[PDB]
Amino acid sequence: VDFPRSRLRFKEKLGEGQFGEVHLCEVDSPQDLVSHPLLVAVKILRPDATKNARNDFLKEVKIMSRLKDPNIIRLLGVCVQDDPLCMITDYMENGDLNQFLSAHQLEDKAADPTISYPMLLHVAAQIASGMRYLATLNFVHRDLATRNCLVGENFTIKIADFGMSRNLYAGDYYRVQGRAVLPIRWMAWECILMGKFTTASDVWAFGVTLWEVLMLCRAQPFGQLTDEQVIENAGEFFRDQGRQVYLSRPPACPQGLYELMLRCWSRESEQRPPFSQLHRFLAEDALNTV
Ligand SMILES: O=C(Nc1ccc(Cl)c(C(=O)Nc2cnc3[nH]ccc3c2)c1)c1ccc(NCCO)c(Cl)c1
Ligand SMILES: [Cl-]
């Protein structure tokens, strides 16, 4: 689908991704789009966009064009050849999952918006389903975290990617001059030591994302340890002498679900559960832990 920027009406800035800024737009005659007025999210180049940023933007279009799953952000169209570049996606009206969940507390069984434990499972299950789909494409996300998930109506979740440069989440990334930026607290030990990312390291990051969800996004993973201590913990996984440490069991997390999380952090990549198995546990098995 090709869409004219003239037929868009820009309403407010939603945030920024790695290679452009995102705006909420209205559409009056939304016939062409793949899917009162229709609301969509539109990514455009920054006003100081370089030749390199445009190149990275065009490649993002290509990557996005194949993502077709209910729990992955979906490209509805792009702007026409003569227009300035743009990408159009669905508008997730509740925004960032980290910020959204941070605004809730776990419902008190006995006696300010709240969220139930079964709804936490439903949020986690949708992320697992989206990751299951990505694994079928042999697509490695490399930065799964609640800050990269979006929330629509009725707690529908879409996995997206905002990149690593937003100020709000700067503390979630480890920066060294001349090196790739690294979300080390979400990274499997072999990613930290060897810089290589696989579906099995996405499973590790899903474990941390699940931990985030059960913490209601109120705490950074390994939050009381320094970046240097988190990196040294990867060495303790490598050496395999029983000195490595794990994220602790969240109060909202029953032991059966926590043992699933621990399996995501297995030293051996092949022993980590596939997303097909994680999805089934969260959608079914975990229901007898309510
Ligand atoms: O999400 C990716 N690109 C993308 C494009 C266009 C838009 Cl408009 C958006 C977007 O943020 N939309 C949106 C919708 N509702 C909202 N409500 C509140 C904020 C807000 C934002 C995002 C992306 C990029 C690279 C990837 N992989 C490449 C790197 O490995 C992957 Cl998997 C995904
Ligand atoms: Cl800690």
Side-chain angles (χ1 to χ4, degrees), residues 1-35 37-290:
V1 182
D2 304 332
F3 210 82
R5 182 193 286 234
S6 64
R7 210 192 287 181
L8 298 165
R9 297 208 317 281
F10 288 71
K11 290 303 156 186
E12 75 188 37
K13 194 181 188 170
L14 293 178
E16 294 195 350
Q18 193 183 352
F19 302 119
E21 47 183 55
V22 179
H23 293 265
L24 175 61
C25 299
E26 298 188 302
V27 185
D28 289 328
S29 72
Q31 28 122 5
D32 286 338
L33 285 174
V34 120
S35 289
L38 168 71
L39 298 183
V40 295
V42 181
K43 183 178 286 183
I44 61 177
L45 292 170
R46 297 186 164 85
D48 57 350
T50 60
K51 192 183 80 162
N52 296 348
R54 174 185 153 100
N55 174 248
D56 273 311
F57 189 108
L58 288 177
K59 288 195 299 200
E60 177 170 331
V61 173
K62 296 182 172 214
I63 296 156
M64 285 274 288
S65 72
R66 39 206 269 244
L67 304 184
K68 297 163 175 172
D69 185 83
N71 294 118
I72 305 295
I73 187 168
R74 172 176 290 261
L75 189 65
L76 306 186
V78 298
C79 284
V80 80
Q81 301 291 129
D82 293 334
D83 282 349
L85 300 180
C86 88
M87 279 177 274
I88 309 176
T89 72
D90 296 298
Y91 170 49
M92 312 307 298
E93 73 173 14
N94 282 306
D96 184 314
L97 176 66
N98 188 281
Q99 299 306 292
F100 180 77
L101 276 184
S102 295
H104 295 69
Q105 47 182 352
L106 184 70
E107 66 173 15
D108 183 354
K109 212 60 175 176
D112 291 286
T114 59
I115 189 175
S116 71
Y117 172 67
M119 185 59 79
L120 294 175
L121 294 176
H122 176 56
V123 169
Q126 292 178 81
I127 299 165
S129 188
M131 293 304 297
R132 178 179 52 195
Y133 167 79
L134 289 183
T136 73
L137 306 184
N138 297 292
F139 185 84
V140 175
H141 188 283
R142 307 167 67 93
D143 192 18
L144 178 61
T146 61
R147 61 182 176 274
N148 279 324
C149 296
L150 289 164
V151 190
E153 304 191 0
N154 302 294
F155 296 86
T156 53
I157 310 290
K158 281 190 176 271
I159 300 172
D161 193 351
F162 288 85
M164 313 197 179
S165 298
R166 301 182 292 174
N167 291 329
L168 179 54
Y169 298 112
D172 294 343
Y173 296 98
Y174 178 67
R175 287 165 299 267
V176 172
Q177 190 167 18
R179 292 192 194 166
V181 183
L182 296 173
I184 53 169
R185 296 164 186 273
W186 282 258
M187 284 171 56
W189 68 268
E190 75 272 8
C191 303
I192 293 173
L193 300 189
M194 281 152 275
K196 276 155 194 197
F197 294 82
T198 64
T199 296
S201 63
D202 275 351
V203 168
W204 180 297
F206 174 82
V208 178
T209 300
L210 175 59
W211 182 93
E212 290 185 86
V213 169
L214 292 154
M215 292 294 288
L216 286 93
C217 295
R218 302 270 178 105
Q220 186 188 52
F222 295 114
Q224 303 289 82
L225 306 181
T226 64
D227 286 344
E228 294 65 36
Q229 288 174 310
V230 172
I231 291 170
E232 174 62 24
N233 191 46
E236 291 294 346
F237 277 97
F238 174 62
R239 290 190 287 278
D240 203 17
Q241 295 170 330
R243 306 190 218 145
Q244 72 278 355
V245 297
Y246 303 89
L247 297 173
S248 299
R249 185 173 61 87
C253 180
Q255 176 66 22
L257 185 59
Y258 181 64
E259 289 169 6
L260 181 79
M261 284 171 38
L262 292 170
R263 295 200 50 218
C264 296
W265 306 320
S266 302
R267 185 194 184 275
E268 310 304 324
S269 292
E270 69 275 5
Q271 292 171 21
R272 297 174 198 157
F275 284 114
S276 63
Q277 167 171 154
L278 293 163
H279 179 79
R280 177 173 56 255
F281 192 98
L282 294 161
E284 300 294 325
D285 289 71
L287 290 179
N288 58 46
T289 76
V290 185

